[PDB]
Symmetry: D2
Subunit: 314 residues, 4 copies
DNA sequence: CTGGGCGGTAGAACCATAGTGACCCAG
DNA sequence: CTGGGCGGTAGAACCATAGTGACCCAG
């Protein structure tokens, strides 16, 4: 039988996922949310695209975690992101930690009940924290659960570099590890263009250290830059998630940077962090540890510590 | 060079248009709107997806109609939609928007293929035809590709068959007075009647499906959503049959020049879309009752047109 | 894991099937043939395209039916087609290909009795049934290549006369693959509209259509005479059937299938629209033919029976 | 019109798979050309039917006249002699093909100058680094509009074998092979990457050894011969790689691809073609990327160019 | 006028979109 | 029983494919 993909959280990212799943004919889809009616309106609208996509994927809405039964893949986008109400007086980012943890407790008990064999991809912020919470509460194997990070962060670094150098955006390859968010580690040494080290282009003066540094800042701050323009980053995220999902379902064994459990790589254990892994039929088939230098380790360490500062507060 | 596609209106539907055009690598995309900054924001979000999709489309934002310069396709979703009061009251206002767009199309891309979406589409498209001055095989409205996609989908579900394998025609006007042609429905090329006679589906089941298709927009709004995914996709099907010269047969709103007995009005019929825009207008051989429904659809477009 | 697809026979049809399978990321592919080494060479050349296609399918060559182990789909193109010369009797190949089906079905029992089987070896409507008998698979799991291929020509020709998308023309040809095919002039449509309307509008004449039908019946023969032999369209038609099964698309497709009373016939295979999805043949759709068209159908079936008697 | 019109000059096995892929991918109208009578018409007629399966709308035509180059957007040249033409040709070696295939290129290039001076041309006829320059010389087209097939094909064998060893996606291996297509290709150990990471990190991790890499390198060099030794013939991958190049052009993808291109100073060489990564978009070769080779790598490039030169002198 | 207590994957209304700011009272 | 002319994007025939080897005299 066809893959069943559950979307836990039917907000904007969730809507773009549904769309791309039906474009790619990837599986049946359930748009789940606690908010009533709304996932149904989106599922119906999106289901008609089967005709235009020449696909055959059921799309439905849901308001019950019972719909997790038989799920092949679960994608968690739902969670608090801002002050929940007008009443929440002087609240900050950290305040959201106990609330999302409560959501992950609930979702994980239902995974454990309804789809202990699903492959799980967590997006809810801060993802490196949230993914570990959901791994702990679901009981799923460490290679069947991952967090969204590097694909997205890097797709913006690839893209900004590709514009300066006038090549296919995907012919830029870059790594960004450790954590998603402000403390992300941008690995200047591990950038390439058509498989050629970025440094050769800096030597030909096709791009300079300072323009690269400025691209490094714009990458770290992309989500802010977009919100400042009166929009919201949701298309990019959705597509990077679907890339990861697709690599699992179709067993492409792509090298993709995800948040994953470190069992001693980079000198860290029992914490999840961003690192390229190989994604196939078996989940995370390979965790690849980049042979960082000392100043690269130092940055990696500060991203891990920050993951740890927030985990403790959940 | 690569095709330039300009989205005139960057609300949700426009957002799904960019997205799809970058997945099929179909053209550079400009997201235009009068709302300051937001199109820049969405353009910037969408553009990153070149990477996941292996594409190489430039995706821009814009607040000037100057960026119509060199457009090969323009897609027009902008316009007043919300407020009892009378929906007819929006007609002169959206007429004023068509004027504006039209004269800018006159200046910057008189050779563009134009697709109109703004409701009521059959009126909006003619008004923009008229102010843009473009030739008549180069402008169309969205109508039946979207409408027939529900009908197609709903039937395929009852019959357990690939959605796309159901073909069905909906003519006349987009909206309330749309004409659902039961005699023109087929499943794998086979008339539906054969499946009714086999009792794989009943006449009253089909009737329920018909009412469901006419009220789909309303249903979705009732559900606390609003249709934009399917409309986007159906429009990108149109723009892609044109850009790739596929000559697909697609129902759309086009100028009637005597067909169905009507003139000087736009209305939903099958056409063939390809590199030359509207390449043929297929006029279905309607019996007398189907023709009474067509006529009511047209008279409704006319009645709205007179108020524009 | 990914779908395993065994191609039993690695002539040129086999080759195009492995390419498209890799282009569509459909499944690992095994090219089997009785001829030594040749399938390993083709496997090797095909496996490279994974890189250009962004796919990840294994392509292996084999000379052993043991490689049928774990197959999800099996496509049988192997068999004698050529004379031992000049004027001779093509019926002579019937018994010989019968032995081959016997042998394949022997190993299909052993190795992959749950596989979906697609048979191509001509005359297909006889060979498919022969393989159904010697393999023992459910009748919803074994179909022959027929109408997807034949109609694709019909649809293609009409599309060129009318200047629309090839795919926007639909038509049915049923009964048998080959010279007795029944071309149903009443079931052709163009973007969902009866052909008759375009006929009434003088955009294609009745005579033009008849000449198009003659050409659809004689397409193989026209290709051979231009010194080619048709294998691209066949491969792609088989890949359409395959895909609909593997991706559970539920496409309506004309295939050689087991008849249980439809068109008045039983215990024979013949061409008819089916629905293909993850359960195999999911519906056998019986066209509501008038007795003139039905008479054509019995002609096609009679021929199939006659050839079946000689195998 | 656009559609693109793509003319396959040579309707043999590679031309056959190319036409098919062009239809699968809706890339444009296809003319299968060849001097052999009728066969291109038959092949083009079999291939035309697949438009229905593919949901495409490409014309597929046969032709026996160079007149059908009129209005081509892309020309792909696979025609040429690859073996001793006849039983009567005794004691032929590879060099003897050079004058024959040169005559072919004079004939093709004359017709391009006449009917499609603005086409983009991809040459595949072996030895390809000599043949592309001969067609450049005899056609008169700009140097950014003519390339030969080399590195995309060779690199796909090395990306492949590595990926099998490391159990990753074949295309998440990137590698560079330069200089020339054939025996003297230069395999750059230093440039290999697996999902963006130097192959040296996996070697350090003992996931692949230096000796296994070397043996993979030998296989890459001899793949054509290893296929033919198994009673088959490499035509699928070649046709795939060619379509990859063509596509990057017809869609202005600006992919970095290794092609045989005109060297003007890069690697210390001029007035010769050789394999190097290039950028291919709407304007043809939009950039020629010179890899920053070290002196032993460059001595290798120098043996590749030398060989190309030796054969060029013989055409 | 505050201060805090709900209750919240918030809450209005702006108005060619959607991020910003979005409660309620007792006392 | 060799030799070499002509003509060749070669040429037979082996056959469950296709690469290998594939002409034809005049002396």
């Amino acid at each position: 039988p066809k893959a069943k993909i559950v979307l836990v959280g039917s907000g904007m990212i969730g809507g773009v996922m549904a769309t791309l799943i039906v474009q790619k004919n990837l599986g049946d889809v359930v748009l789940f949310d606690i908010v009533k009616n709304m996932p149904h309106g989106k599922a119906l609208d999106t289901s008609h695209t089967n005709v235009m996509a020449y696909s055959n994927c059921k799309v439905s809405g849901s308001n019950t975690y019972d719909d997790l039964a038989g799920a092949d893949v679960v994608i968690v986008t739902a969670g608090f992101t801002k002050a929940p109400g007008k009443s929440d007086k002087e609240w900050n980012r950290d305040d959201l930690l106990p609330l999302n943890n409560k959501i992950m407790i609930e979702i994980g008990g239902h995974i454990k009940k309804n789809c202990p064999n699903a492959f799980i991809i967590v997006v809810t912020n801060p993802v490196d924290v949230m993914v570990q919470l959901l791994h702990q509460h679901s009981g799923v194997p460490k290679n069947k659960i991952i967090g969204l990070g590097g694909v997205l962060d890097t797709s913006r670094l690839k893209y900004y570099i590709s514009q300066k150098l006038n090549v296919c955006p995907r012919d830029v390859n870059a790594h960004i590890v450790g954590a998603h968010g402000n403390k992300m580690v941008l690995l200047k040494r591990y950038i390439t263009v058509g498989g050629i080290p970025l440094q050769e282009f800096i030597n030909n003066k096709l791009i300079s250290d300072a323009e690269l540094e400025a691209i490094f800042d714009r990458t770290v701050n992309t989500a802010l830059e977009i919100v400042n323009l009166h929009a919201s980053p949701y298309v990019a995220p959705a597509a990077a998630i679907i890339e990861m999902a697709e690599s699992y379902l179709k067993d492409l064994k792509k090298v993709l940077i995800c948040s994953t459990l470190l069992e001693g790589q980079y000198g860290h254990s029992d914490i999840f962090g961003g690192t390229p892994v190989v994604l196939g039929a078996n989940g995370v088939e390979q965790v690849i540890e980049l042979q960082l230098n000392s100043e690269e380790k130092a940055k990696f360490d500060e991203a891990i510590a920050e993951t740890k500062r927030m985990k403790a507060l959940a």
